[PDB]
């Protein structure tokens, strides 16, 4: 059986040693955080070094969802997905240089808090907090848990219930009461283990496929023997490899992930994921200085070039070695091998792991997959706790002390942990052969409005609370309309094409993301220009025009000397000359490397 190879010996030893090390680092960092005050728990004390910030930025994004989805979908259509990671680096640079300086200069623990400070209404913050939490609980928790299930059932023998329970407990021991200091200090280990074990796997896979050139040639002839049987044969497009496989920039309409939608829509919802989304920014706001965030974000981008060569390429190698398993089309064979009737394309990475590498390497590598999942789940849980405590619980009790907010955050971590075990039945039982398509569709409907509202709350001065609210509501209504109309009719199978009309279903979800971005942008601008503006007195240091200004600010949400100095330092965003120069230069180098890679493959 495929789930007994890891049973031998060194597999268990390596996984248990990994667990011991991660738990130990979590506990040590738990006693190095000054927990008990919000400044030290949710923001880690604003004392994090540069490189742990970068490590956490990588490991919070990269989860089991990435490994499973990238490898499997790479077995479907080539390098198409890799560019997600690559767009990440450009936008992380953008984040580090533009968005974090304002948020630090605004003293905003949460992004909805920044929006309240700039706009001056409770409903904006409440709506954004609730929507962001729903996006968390659905998209990211689903990605992590589903991919956990896939690589667990294929590689291990553990039932989803026990496995997800144990992973949640291991996480909970340090995330529930660890805050960002514990998160990042345990996350740096996740990142290091991931990079090491995954470099070993990619090297082994490329050696066994015979190198990159032979990899290219062999991949294009990985056509499954069986294309017949059952009710009917299949149209020579559900199994054959794609001719545009090795190009990132594919046809604008004919191909999956067309280049216009690719670059534009991907940037649009990546501004949500990195610059506006709560999970990633907390990592940047927990810094010791303003140069440490730039160091972290450059490192994150530099080793965000790696993902493709470690997830997309192995998936292809998984297809080439085991084409019959990772390229089945016949419903009988597909239902036979792993599970879902249509699919079996999602098991490319875990089959490559459980088969390619030797015993000890298989153990360490399976623990890499676990390392992926734990980091993302820790990140989302802590960020959801921060959002809840800072907006919803804060507005349900205006006289709450710090201890009450801390206990509220911890209880929210507990409840949101329980939501994941409540989620495992849906993810297991539902027909999830197209799960990642749905996850990206969900993120492509509710993201662009929030990206627009924040890009206008920063790079603009006239927007106001009516405009932001009603643009967000309109964008939500459009996204929900399309989402319901696409889920009710359901996304089309290869043998049985789509049911639903071409206006809704014909448009690729990235194209609809950009369209919704444009509509929300226009609506926010129009409604804002109809209502009286917010004077500049209330917007010092909250818009890109006024960040340098040092006049007194009338907040829209409205020792002593030592406390004032500490506050000013926490809002201080100035670095030394030489360090600033080095950080600008290395950021430019990172973006250059990305442009070179984009041009090299695409």
């Amino acid at each position: 059986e495929t789930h007994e190879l890891i049973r031998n010996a060194a597999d268990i030893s390596i996984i248990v040693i990994y667990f011991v090390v991660v738990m130990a680092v979590g506990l040590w960092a738990m006693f190095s955080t000054n927990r008990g005050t919000v400044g030290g728990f949710f923001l880690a004390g604003r004392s994090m070094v540069w490189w742990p910030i970068g490590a956490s930025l990588f490991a919070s994004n990269i989860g089991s969802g990435h490994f499973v989805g990238l490898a499997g979908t790479g077995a479907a259509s080539g390098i198409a997905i890799g560019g997600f990671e690559w767009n990440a680096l450009v936008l992380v640079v953008v984040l580090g240089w533009l968005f974090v300086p304002i948020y630090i200069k605004a003293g905003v623990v949460t992004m909805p808090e920044y929006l309240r400070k700039r706009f001056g209404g409770q409903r904006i913050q409440v709506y954004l907090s609730l929507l962001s939490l729903l996006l968390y609980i659905f998209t990211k928790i689903s990605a992590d848990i589903f991919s956990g299930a896939i690589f667990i059932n294929l590689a291990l023998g553990l039932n989803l219930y026990l496995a997800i329970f144990l992973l949640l407990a291991i996480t909970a021991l340090y995330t529930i009461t660890g805050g960002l200091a514990a998160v990042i200090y345990t996350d740096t280990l996740q990142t290091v283990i991931m990079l090491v074990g995954s470099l070993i796997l990619t090297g082994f896979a490329f050696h066994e496929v015979g190198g990159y050139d032979a990899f290219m040639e062999k991949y294009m002839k990985a056509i499954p023997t069986i294309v017949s049987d059952g009710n009917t044969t299949f149209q020579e497009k559900c199994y054959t490899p794609r001719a545009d496989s090795f190009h990132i920039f594919r046809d604008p309409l004919t191909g999956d992930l067309p280049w216009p939608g690719f670059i534009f829509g991907m940037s649009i919802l990546t501004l949500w994921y990195w610059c506006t989304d709560q999970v990633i920014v907390q990592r940047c706001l927990s810094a010791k200085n303003m140069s440490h965030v730039k160091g972290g974000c450059i490192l994150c981008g530099y080793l965000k070039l790696m993902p493709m060569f470690i997830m997309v390429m192995p998936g292809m190698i998984s297809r080439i070695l085991y084409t019959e398993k990772i390229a089945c089309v016949v419903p009988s064979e597909c239902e036979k091998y792993c599970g879902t009737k249509v699919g079996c394309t999602n098991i490319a990475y875990p089959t490559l792991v459980v088969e390619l590498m030797p015993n000890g390497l298989r153990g360490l590598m399976l623990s890499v997959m676990l390392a992926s999942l734990m980091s993302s789940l820790t990140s989302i849980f802590n960020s959801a706790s921060t959002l809840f405590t800072m907006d919803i619980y804060a507005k349900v009790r205006k006289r709450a002390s710090e201890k009450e907010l801390m206990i509220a955050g911890r209880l929210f971590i507990l409840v949101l942990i329980g939501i994941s075990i409540a989620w495992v039945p849906i993810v297991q039982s539902a027909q999830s052969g197209q799960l990642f398509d749905y996850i990206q569709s969900i993120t492509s409907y509710l993201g662009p409005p929030i990206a627009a509202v924040f890009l206008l709350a920063i790079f603009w001065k006239r927007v106001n609370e009516p405009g932001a609210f009603w643009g967000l509501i309109l964008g939500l209504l459009i996204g929900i309309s399309r989402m319901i109309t696409e889920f009710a009719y359901g996304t089309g199978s290869c043998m049985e094409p789509s049911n639903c009309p071409t206006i809704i279903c014909g448009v690729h979800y990235l194209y609809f993301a950009i369209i919704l971005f444009a509509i929300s942008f226009i609506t926010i601008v129009v409604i804002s220009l109809l209502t009286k503006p917010i004077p500049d007195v209330h917007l010092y240091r909250l818009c890109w025009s006024l960040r340098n200004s040092k006049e007194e600010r009338i907040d829209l949400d409205a020792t002593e000397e030592e406390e004032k100095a500490m506050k000013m330092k926490m809002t201080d965003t100035s670095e030394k000359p030489l360090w600033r120069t080095v950080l600008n230069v290395n950021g430019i180098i990172l973006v250059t490397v990305a442009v070179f890679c984009h041009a090299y493959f695409a």
Partner: protein, 34 residues
Amino acid sequence: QGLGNLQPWMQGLIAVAVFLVLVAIAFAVNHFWC
């Protein structure tokens, strides 16, 4: 990965040259206007 007669790595070189020219042009424009 071949477009036209272009080698895969020559795209990297050309794209880097264009991007560096754009960075230098943007820096010069920023300096002149700020």
